């Protein structure tokens, strides 16, 4: 263009800035590690990193939004939001596959909670 001539849909998580994390947004992962006195916060962080990368590479172009990783006791719930573009048979295949891999990789009863949506739920435009 020209020098003084210079002088995108976003979901809720994308729209709101980091300084709203406890004001408007929430926390994607929920666990006891960061509480006072509790241990293994770093191990939970590393587990979260691996889960997010694995899920984004195992459901490519399906996840409409970011994961929600809940932990109760030794349970590990992945609440994901996906699109209605892939066939349900492939979704069932991938759910079973991912559940079994993550259970045998983290030695805990992992479980997965797909929620399909017709399309990205755009909050605003930035």
């Amino acid at each position: 263009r020209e020098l003084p001539c210079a002088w995108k849909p976003v979901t809720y998580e994308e729209a709101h800035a980091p300084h709203y994390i406890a004001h408007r947004k929430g926390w994607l992962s929920l666990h006891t590690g960061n509480l006072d006195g509790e241990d293994h916060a770093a191990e939970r962080t590393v587990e979260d990193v691996f889960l997010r990368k694995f899920m984004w590479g195992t459901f490519p172009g399906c996840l409409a939004d970011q994961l929600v990783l809940k932990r109760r006791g030794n349970q590990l719930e992945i609440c994901a939001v996906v699109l209605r573009q892939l066939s349900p048979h492939k979704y069932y295949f991938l759910v079973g596959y991912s559940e079994t891999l993550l259970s045998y990789f983290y030695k805990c009863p992992v479980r997965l909670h797909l929620q399909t949506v017709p399309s990205k739920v755009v909050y605003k435009y930035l």
Binding site: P18, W27, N34, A42, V49
Partner: protein, 33 residues
């Protein structure tokens, strides 16, 4: 380790091991002040 232990006897933030994850709300409990 134990051998060295016995012979001697005879003689950044690491709590999470961050700004990316903390700013995208991926670390539970972490928020800006």
């Amino acid at each position: 380790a134990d051998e060295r232990l016995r012979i001697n006897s005879l003689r950044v933030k690491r709590r999470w091991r961050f700004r990316h994850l903390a700013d995208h709300g991926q670390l539970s409990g972490i928020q800006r002040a």
